[PDB]
Amino acid sequence: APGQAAVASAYQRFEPRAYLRNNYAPPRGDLCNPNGVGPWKLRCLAQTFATGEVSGRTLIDIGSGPTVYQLLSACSHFEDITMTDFLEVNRQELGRWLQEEPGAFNWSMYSQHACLIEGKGECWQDKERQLRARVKRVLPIDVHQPQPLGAGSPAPLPADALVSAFCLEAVSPDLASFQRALDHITTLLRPGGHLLLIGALEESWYLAGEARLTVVPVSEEEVREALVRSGYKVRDLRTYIMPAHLQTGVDDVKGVFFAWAQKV
Amino acid sequence: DSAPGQAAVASAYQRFEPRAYLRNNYAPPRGDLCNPNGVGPWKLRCLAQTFATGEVSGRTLIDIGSGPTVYQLLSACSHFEDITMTDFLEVNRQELGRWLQEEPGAFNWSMYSQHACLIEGKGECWQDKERQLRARVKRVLPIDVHQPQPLGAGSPAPLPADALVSAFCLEAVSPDLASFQRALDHITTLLRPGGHLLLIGALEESWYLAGEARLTVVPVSEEEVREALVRSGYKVRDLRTYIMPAHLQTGVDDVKGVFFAWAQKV
Ligand SMILES: Nc1ncnc2c1ncn2[C@@H]1O[C@H](CN(CCCC[C@H]2CNCc3c2ccc(Cl)c3Cl)CC[C@H](N)C(=O)O)[C@@H](O)[C@H]1O
Ligand SMILES: Nc1ncnc2c1ncn2[C@@H]1O[C@H](CN(CCCC[C@H]2CNCc3c2ccc(Cl)c3Cl)CC[C@H](N)C(=O)O)[C@@H](O)[C@H]1O
């Protein structure tokens, strides 16, 4: 209870352009080295969709921030995609890239790299235009509320799949509120539907301009137990250890996990 | 071709010192079983949970590159009546011998025995666990994983084995990723079809200390390990990663984490 309120006000001085710079510009945002964090995340997402076993008509992205890369492979498989964030400054950053306003963030290195590893011969402009086409709305959300999108949100629940990258551990004061947030997102999921969850391993803080966020250090084992304790069969869970040269002064992340889990 | 690098491996290990090795890695801080997010506890949990499924049993088990260590068999001996231990260095097989016959001056594994019993939760005492391991270790043979027949021809070992266990062998003795794959393929000729393989190993490491021996290994990663297991005829049932914490990251090695693989041969 008290911790969930300190998270909320730390996130008030979250500078999205500073966030995008620390994590999606060089070095972490240079996609040329295939052993980097960028290529690893996109490969996880693409391998998982290329199986064919994750599909439907509706998808919800929990805690998108100002980022779109986590739906680049997703959007070939879902026609109504809902993106969500707690902060309006991020949804207005999401707005400017979906509507192609000036000063939108240049995501084309990531569209390029997703097209290359999907390997279906798709140019990146078609990938970007397909994502804008299928992303219907950009809604507020609070993963701590037992209903996270408000009483009667415009979103077509229950969704067929959730994507959530770097959200829960970054917004939860401790292991317990992280588990509750997972319980809360899971009610948004049609039973038998799929969760695709990316997050930081063993991280306790990261910087977003003037915001200094505190984060609950989660391990891969804690992540697996939390997915079952919320009723998922864990289909995949993989870890990326963070190389020295991607350890900048913007956080203390030690690794990144990817989870493919299916509601039971 | 890789035969030269394998010869440097052999050469370097002739400075491997068992007593010094054990102290760097199995007495505190690395061998601290009280810190539950330490690495010792994590490896034991992986083995004890895997065996607790009931899906890994049979008559014969072969431990691949045992070194002078036994923890990697502590949960396994409840399930296999015939255990084969193996190592490249006679001095290591002698260290095992010191422990098999209960000599003082052999290494004290009882902190590890006690932790395994505590984790298995069958209320067993650690002296029973040890007496059962000493009883079910039927032989300690030389092994070389770079040979096509790693135990040599017509060795004593009951072949083919029902399961294999290997802690930190393949990636620590392989000059490049190609001999690592070849070494995987050689040991899988000892495992019967449908048998299970339990692999523990270092992730992304290039040197470690085995007694002011600076031995230099090829770094591997999780996804390199998965692709090598499928490339050998295995379906991967579990692939877990332990990130070496900064506080256990001392001057012993440059290891960045540890992996556990449970795979089954088709
Ligand atoms: N109460 C709440 N309920 C719901 N959502 C809430 C609530 N409170 C805040 N939020 C929203 O949560 C989002 C959090 N993240 C950023 C978290 C930090 C990530 C960072 C950590 N350090 C390592 C590392 C990172 C990133 C990339 C790489 Cl590579 C590495 Cl290594 C959105 C990010 C985006 N999804 C994306 O994937 O980048 C914010 O937008 C915020 O507004
Ligand atoms: N050609 C060959 N064919 C077959 N076996 C051969 C051949 N050449 C040599 N060998 C044998 O390979 C064995 C390897 N050692 C340990 C290697 C280094 C481990 C070290 C690395 N740094 C990270 C780390 C470590 C240990 C613990 C933890 Cl926690 C961490 Cl993090 C025995 C391993 C033992 N099973 C055990 O598990 O300790 C030696 O005995 C040697 O004789």
Side-chain angles (χ1 to χ4, degrees), chain A residues 1-3 5-264, chain B:
Chain A
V7 199
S9 266
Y11 274 97
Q12 289 319 301
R13 322 178 31 180
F14 190 98
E15 256 166 299
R17 302 294 260 199
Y19 176 78
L20 295 174
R21 204 171 84 103
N22 299 338
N23 299 292
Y24 299 101
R28 306 207 168 160
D30 198 305
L31 315 178
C32 280
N33 188 292
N35 293 308
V37 62
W40 182 89
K41 287 192 279 176
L42 302 179
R43 221 147 37 220
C44 278
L45 288 163
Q47 310 192 339
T48 291
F49 290 123
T51 69
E53 303 210 351
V54 200
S55 54
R57 85 196 169 64
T58 175
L59 174 83
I60 302 180
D61 180 22
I62 325 298
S64 312
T67 80
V68 304
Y69 71 92
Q70 67 273 23
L71 310 182
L72 286 171
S73 294
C75 74
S76 306
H77 297 56
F78 298 82
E79 27 191 21
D80 180 89
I81 294 162
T82 306
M83 301 188 75
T84 70
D85 200 58
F86 179 90
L87 300 179
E88 184 152 73
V89 74
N90 277 331
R91 310 189 301 270
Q92 286 184 335
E93 197 73 46
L94 265 194
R96 297 197 289 137
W97 182 90
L98 293 168
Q99 324 295 342
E100 314 197 48
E101 293 142 31
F105 191 71
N106 177 19
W107 282 105
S108 66
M109 306 299 146
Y110 290 76
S111 325
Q112 284 160 10
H113 200 271
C115 293
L116 179 48
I117 65 191
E118 266 169 43
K120 329 167 182 145
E122 176 174 350
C123 72
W124 64 268
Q125 303 92 330
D126 287 4
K127 182 66 108 184
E128 279 195 339
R129 155 179 331 112
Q130 171 165 242
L131 176 62
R132 301 195 233 238
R134 304 207 166 187
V135 162
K136 305 312 187 180
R137 69 199 135 265
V138 181
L139 314 189
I141 179 156
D142 185 330
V143 300
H144 297 310
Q145 307 304 330
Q147 147 49 20
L149 293 146
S153 89
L157 280 65
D160 297 293
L162 293 324
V163 166
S164 166
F166 293 107
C167 189
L168 303 185
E169 78 278 355
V171 302
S172 299
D174 43 51
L175 192 154
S177 51
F178 169 100
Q179 176 91 58
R180 259 191 305 284
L182 179 58
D183 288 325
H184 299 158
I185 84 176
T186 313
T187 63
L188 262 43
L189 190 45
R190 151 193 95 66
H194 296 278
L195 181 49
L196 294 213
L197 192 72
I198 301 175
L201 290 171
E202 297 294 347
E203 144 181 283
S204 55
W205 60 272
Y206 72 99
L207 293 176
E210 308 234 297
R212 191 265 185 201
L213 294 315
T214 89
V215 167
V216 48
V218 286
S219 71
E220 181 183 76
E221 300 217 314
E222 282 161 342
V223 158
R224 200 199 313 274
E225 69 78 10
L227 286 167
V228 297
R229 269 199 212 256
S230 300
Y232 291 95
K233 168 178 48 142
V234 169
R235 315 269 277 97
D236 200 28
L237 183 63
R238 315 194 149 154
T239 283
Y240 173 84
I241 290 136
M242 189 75 16
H245 69 282
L246 263 53
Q247 300 170 14
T248 60
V250 304
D251 52 50
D252 72 329
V253 66
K254 295 243 280 151
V256 180
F257 73 84
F258 170 85
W260 175 21
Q262 173 170 232
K263 191 166 174 186
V264 152
Chain B
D1 166 44
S2 278
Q6 295 169 5
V9 172
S11 167
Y13 272 99
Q14 210 72 42
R15 158 143 67 94
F16 191 96
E17 158 47 26
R19 295 321 292 225
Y21 177 65
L22 300 172
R23 168 159 32 90
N24 301 334
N25 298 113
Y26 301 105
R30 289 226 145 159
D32 189 344
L33 301 183
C34 287
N35 175 28
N37 319 66
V39 59
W42 184 90
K43 305 185 279 184
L44 296 185
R45 234 145 50 223
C46 292
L47 289 160
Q49 296 172 12
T50 293
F51 285 109
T53 87
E55 302 185 51
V56 186
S57 35
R59 180 210 328 137
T60 65
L61 181 138
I62 298 168
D63 193 23
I64 298 277
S66 311
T69 76
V70 303
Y71 72 92
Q72 78 274 25
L73 301 173
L74 283 167
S75 287
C77 58
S78 325
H79 298 77
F80 294 86
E81 293 172 326
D82 180 301
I83 298 184
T84 298
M85 290 188 94
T86 65
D87 191 78
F88 183 74
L89 300 181
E90 157 155 76
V91 292
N92 271 334
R93 306 192 299 263
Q94 287 204 356
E95 206 36 59
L96 299 184
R98 250 167 274 198
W99 185 85
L100 280 151
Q101 57 199 313
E102 271 196 275
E103 288 186 7
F107 189 82
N108 173 33
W109 286 106
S110 78
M111 241 68 54
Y112 281 85
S113 307
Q114 163 71 346
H115 205 73
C117 299
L118 171 62
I119 276 191
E120 300 179 22
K122 302 162 173 172
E124 193 175 41
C125 67
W126 67 259
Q127 302 104 312
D128 289 353
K129 176 77 84 192
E130 293 199 339
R131 171 168 30 255
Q132 170 171 222
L133 183 46
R134 286 187 246 241
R136 293 147 111 93
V137 173
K138 298 317 185 179
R139 74 206 98 251
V140 184
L141 318 164
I143 196 175
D144 175 12
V145 295
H146 302 306
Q147 310 302 316
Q149 309 157 84
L151 312 166
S155 100
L159 266 39
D162 294 306
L164 293 182
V165 181
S166 193
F168 298 108
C169 191
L170 289 212
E171 82 288 354
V173 309
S174 274
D176 45 51
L177 186 78
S179 44
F180 175 94
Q181 178 75 73
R182 268 195 304 284
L184 193 40
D185 299 332
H186 302 146
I187 73 175
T188 80
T189 67
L190 325 172
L191 173 60
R192 98 184 142 68
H196 308 259
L197 168 47
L198 298 197
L199 217 52
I200 308 183
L203 288 167
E204 289 296 337
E205 146 187 289
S206 68
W207 65 263
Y208 67 109
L209 290 181
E212 260 317 321
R214 213 200 200 190
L215 309 95
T216 88
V217 312
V218 56
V220 298
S221 71
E222 185 178 69
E223 269 54 75
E224 265 163 341
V225 168
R226 192 192 318 274
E227 164 80 319
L229 286 154
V230 317
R231 253 186 248 266
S232 266
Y234 293 93
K235 184 192 39 148
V236 168
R237 305 280 291 283
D238 198 30
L239 193 37
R240 294 197 223 169
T241 294
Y242 176 74
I243 298 178
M244 200 52 89
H247 84 88
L248 257 72
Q249 255 168 331
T250 60
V252 282
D253 37 43
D254 77 338
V255 65
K256 311 303 187 325
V258 184
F259 71 84
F260 176 72
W262 173 20
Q264 175 174 25
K265 173 180 186 190
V266 310

